[PDB]
């Protein structure tokens, strides 16, 4: 990567870019994660996978730079913001209740006051709908709405 | 550690707990965050109450339930403990808590461009 330095004189220097692992198990793929048989084998808990596609301050890398699947880039975007507000990424800060599997921003949800009847009851969502395709080791599907 | 419980999703700000004092205009609704801040042990107490059998035994059963917001436990209560039940949900590990042994074990997935500012 290249970093700028200001002391008016400014400069840019190249420092120790990381390298891709030399032996992908599944070649002939135009995709970073969809090359290691990791299409439906990751979650918001996997910080190591998620930490490779984020800015130092907690943003997301653009698709054109990483070359991810178009639908998978959405999944990485949704998973990262879940981990950020779950406390899983404390070093990537900008510039008290612990939560997990939070789909929406805590400060942008209106509390439900009059829940519906037994046939039209409003449900409080958990997880994300984009992770439906993720593999499940229990035959009961993911409960995305509690 | 009932104070440090975690809710899946936005249950902190979506779930509400409504009670009535019986007087006119006495309907009061508060959210989980408001209730937890006011009473750290109210959330666990109410959750068990709704799942206990709905008979005369429920009140007696709750007399054998003890809740404590923090790690402090009374010496008499701690003296008669027998078994520590395992936690139902595994605590996810933060990024910093991963040691060097497993960080380099996990391979990289992409080649970053040389001239990208990042």
């Amino acid at each position: 990567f290249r970093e700028v330095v200001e002391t008016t004189i400014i400069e840019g220097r190249i420092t120790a870019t990381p390298k891709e692992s030399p032996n992908p198990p599944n070649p002939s793929g135009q995709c970073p994660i969809c090359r290691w048989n990791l299409k439906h084998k990751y979650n918001y808990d996997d910080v190591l996978l998620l930490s490779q596609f984020i800015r130092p301050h907690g943003g997301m890398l653009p698709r054109k730079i990483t070359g991810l699947c178009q639908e998978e880039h959405r999944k990485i975007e949704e998973c990262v913001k879940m981990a950020h507000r779950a406390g899983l990424l404390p070093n990537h800060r900008p510039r008290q209740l612990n939560r997990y599997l939070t789909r929406w921003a805590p400060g942008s949800v209106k509390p439900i006051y009059k829940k519906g009847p037994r046939w039209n009851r409003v449900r409080m969502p958990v997880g994300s709908p984009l992770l439906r395709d993720n593999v499940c080791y229990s035959r009961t599907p993911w409960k995305l709405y509690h | 550690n009932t104070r440090h419980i975690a809710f899946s999703g936005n249950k902190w700000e979506q779930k509400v707990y409504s009670s009535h004092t019986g007087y006119p205009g006495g309907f009061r609704q508060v959210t989980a965050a408001q209730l937890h801040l006011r009473d750290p042990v109210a959330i666990v107490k109410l959750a068990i109450y709704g799942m206990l059998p709905k008979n005369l035994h429920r009140r007696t059963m709750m007399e054998r339930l003890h809740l404590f917001p923090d790690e402090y436990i009374p010496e008499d209560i701690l003296k008669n403990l027998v078994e520590e039940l395992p936690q139902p949900r595994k605590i996810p590990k933060r990024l910093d808590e991963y040691t060097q042994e497993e960080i380099d074990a996990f391979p990289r997935l992409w080649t970053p461009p040389e001239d990208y500012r990042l």
Partner: peptide, 8 residues
Amino acid sequence: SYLPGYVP
């Protein structure tokens, strides 16, 4: 170093 069916 990795088999074709390897998964991290």
